[PDB]
Design a protein around this nucleic acid. Structure first.
Length: 115
RNA sequence: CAGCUUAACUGUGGGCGUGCGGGCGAUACGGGCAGACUAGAGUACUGCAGGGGAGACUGGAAUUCCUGGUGUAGCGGUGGAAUG
């Protein structure tokens, strides 16, 4: 397909990293997850795994003709910036970096404290 | 104080009997009765701040579920995993 400009959704969690590149109206072209590039367990929360997954997703988007993207990073950062650098060095140019993370307005109740 | 060899003991005479009742005096303090005051207290007037309470209606974010797109083979979870 041919999309000159799309959007890239990075979701970095405490124990995973998933990046999906989408068109500006919200239809994903291709995606890569930290477990998709071969890591399992704890090894897939590492910035190296995040960078590898984002690079793979970027290449898969290049095959669909994406030129530039704007990143919507999200979640408790483990590999936000390393995914950003990987996207830059995988051949794309990032337009804007907008950190949109769901913050409730004191709604619902979180799980109890661990020990 | 006196007597029995002294004492224990005994006797004699005051005190004690820490209270109660009757008469008489005092009126500072507490109280009773009759007053007076506004410094306590309460009311009034004018302002002021407040997640004080009860009732009714109503707003946005987020989680979950359902429906429909797109899209693949992983997601999730941990000290590490595995049930899922």
């Amino acid at each position: 397909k041919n999309v000159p400009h799309g959007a890239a959704h990075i979701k970095s969690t405490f124990n995973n990293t998933i990046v999906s590149i989408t068109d500006p109206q919200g239809n994903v072209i291709a995606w890569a997850s930290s477990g998709h590039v071969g890591f399992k367990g704890s090894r897939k929360s590492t910035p190296f795994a995040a960078q590898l997954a984002a690079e793979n997703a970027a290449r898969k988007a290049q095959e669909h003709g994406v030129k530039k993207v704007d990143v919507f990073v999200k979640g408790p950062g483990s590999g936000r910036e390393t995914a950003i650098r990987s996207l830059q060095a995988a051949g794309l140019e990032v337009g804007t970096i907008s950190d949109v993370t769901p913050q409730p307005h004191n709604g619902c109740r979180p799980p109890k404290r661990r020990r």
